[PDB]
């Protein structure tokens, strides 16, 4: 094993601009905060589409369209303990970040 420095390089960018994306979206989603003290980040937010269909102008469900999650692989750090020889190992977690509205696949005969 190799040396992992404790400091995290920060991009410094603050591109973050939208607000309440999850509620304003035509494929709205809800958030689920998963917590692990031996994981970095300790708080991992998991999204979940609220509906199968998409929300129309009147606020009613439209089953002709599908809400689908956008999932991305990410890395977290796992803290391990083996007495005095504390070690760290990378771990891949699949995070659902939000949902989008897609047209369903129309197979036909």
């Amino acid at each position: 094993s190799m040396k992992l420095d404790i400091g995290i390089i920060n991009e410094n960018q603050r591109v973050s601009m939208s607000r309440n994306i999850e509620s304003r979206s035509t494929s709205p989603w809800n958030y689920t905060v998963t917590w692990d003290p031996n994981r970095y980040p300790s708080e991992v937010v998991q999204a979940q589409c609220r509906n199968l269909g998409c929300i129309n102008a009147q606020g009613k469900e439209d089953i002709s369209m599908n809400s689908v999650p956008i999932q991305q692989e990410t890395l977290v750090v796992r803290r391990k303990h083996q007495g005095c020889s504390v070690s760290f190992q990378l771990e891949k977690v699949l995070v659902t970040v939000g949902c989008t509205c897609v047209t369903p696949v129309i197979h036909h005969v």
Binding site: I6, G7, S16, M17, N38, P41, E43, V45, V77
Partner: protein, 423 residues
């Protein structure tokens, strides 16, 4: 304090306490709770103050000052120390800060507060919810969590101390050049999109104009657009920009003028008609009887009534048949606005027919009256009016069935009889 100098992170603290910063956006792990081997430093509660971080006078972020009080907990048994982590989560971003704190052995009182430490600061966007955690490393007690909420751009603190809150596409109106002008005092480099729509009530969509632009600019209005519900929508050409909606014609006079100038009556079925208008204003409608002389159209109230009519919705007649001398009068605010005779091309023009109104008295009698321009005249009459001179011939015409029935009731009826035989 509200405004802070360049974005150098800072930590200060209570009298006699040693405090060093380690923040390299460090990796923070609370881990499991271990037992306390004697006295430990433990955070009691968290508090936050809102600050501003300006790196140049132009670029200022909303910055959140964090503070934590410390006490001495654990077992009881020469000065104490600890390192405390402040985690700052604000979706999507997160940042962690590590502080080293020494407290002297003379302030060490088991069961009291020993001081507090303050960090400036965590930058965050406007109106963003912020979770803040705090814990010692190692962790001897439960974690400290606080959930806060930052103010919108609206809010005296924000918009006064922040310059970034003013990208408004400022709008001005100038109806002085006999037309109407819209002035957009923005910056020269401002890319933005602009929409002019007709703000309908139910089923709002009625687009009228769309343009991508790079202002400032002055837009001229056509005489066909000045209607009350004509509204403006603006936003910069940026991802998820905020759109401004304004309706400055809600009570412009020439707006209503052109609105009722553009309104139209159009027939569907013999017993259904339709009203077309850019906006939707409240209005009543009733059938009217127009003499071939021209304008003096006497409304048929009674036996009818002014029924409400809504724009882009059908109203149904109560007539048995249509007649060329049957117009429709439409009033709003109890003022006659439109007068259109819908049968003038299908069955018109106006025929030389006299209107009669019979009233079924007791014992099912029948008494007749003729609607002349000078009110109605009962028949037979001794006057010199055209109807009274020939009232007997008119009664002969009716009782032979030569007149056209237009409305039937239990105690009333309406008829029209042609007059070409006497002229």
């Amino acid at each position: 304090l509200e405004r802070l100098v360049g974005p150098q992170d800072a930590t200060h603290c209570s009298p006699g306490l040693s405090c060093r910063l380690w923040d390299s956006d460090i990796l923070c792990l609370p881990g499991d709770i271990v037992p306390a081997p004697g006295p430990v430093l433990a955070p009691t509660h968290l508090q936050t103050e809102l600050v501003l971080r300006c790196q140049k006078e132009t670029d200022c972020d909303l910055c959140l000052r964090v503070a934590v009080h410390l006490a001495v907990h654990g077992h009881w048994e020469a000065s104490l120390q600890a390192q405390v982590v402040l985690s700052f989560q604000a979706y999507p971003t997160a940042r962690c800060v590590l502080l080293e704190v020494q407290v002297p052995a003379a302030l060490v009182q088991f069961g009291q507060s020993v001081g507090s430490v303050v960090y400036d600061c965590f930058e965050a966007a406007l109106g963003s919810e912020v979770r803040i955690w705090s814990y010692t490393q190692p962790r001897y007690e439960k974690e400290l969590q606080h959930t806060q909420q930052l103010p919108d751009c609206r809010g005296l603190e924000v918009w006064n101390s922040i310059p970034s809150c003013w990208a408004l596409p400022w709008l001005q109106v100038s109806a002085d050049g006999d037309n109407v002008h819209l002035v957009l005092q923005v910056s020269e480099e401002q890319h933005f999109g602009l929409s002019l729509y007709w703000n309908q009530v139910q089923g709002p969509p009625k687009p009228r104009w769309h343009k991508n632009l790079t202002g400032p600019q002055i837009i001229t209005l056509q005489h066909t657009d000045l209607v009350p519900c004509l509204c403006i929508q603006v936003w910069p050409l940026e991802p998820d920009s905020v759109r401004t909606n304004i309706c400055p014609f809600r009570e412009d006079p020439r707006a209503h003028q052109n609105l009722w100038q553009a309104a139209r009556l159009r027939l569907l079925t013999l017993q259904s008609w339709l009203l077309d208008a850019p906006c939707s204003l409240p209005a009543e409608a009733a059938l009217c009887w127009r003499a071939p002389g021209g304008d003096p159209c006497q409304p048929l109230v009674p036996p009818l009534s002014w029924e409400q009519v809504t724009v882009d919705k059908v109203l149904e007649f109560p007539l048995l048949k249509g007649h060329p001398n049957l117009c429709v009068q439409v009033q709003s605010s109890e003022k006659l606005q439109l007068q259109e005779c819908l049968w003038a091309d299908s069955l018109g023009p106006l025929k030389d027919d006299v209107l009669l109104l019979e009233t079924r008295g007791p014992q099912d009698q029948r008494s007749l009256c003729a609607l002349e321009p000078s009110g109605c005249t009962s028949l037979p009459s001794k006057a010199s009016t055209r109807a009274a001179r020939l009232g007997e011939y008119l009664l002969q015409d009716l009782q032979s069935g030569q007149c056209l029935q237009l409305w039937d009731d239990d105690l009333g009826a309406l008829w029209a009889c042609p007059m070409d035989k006497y002229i």
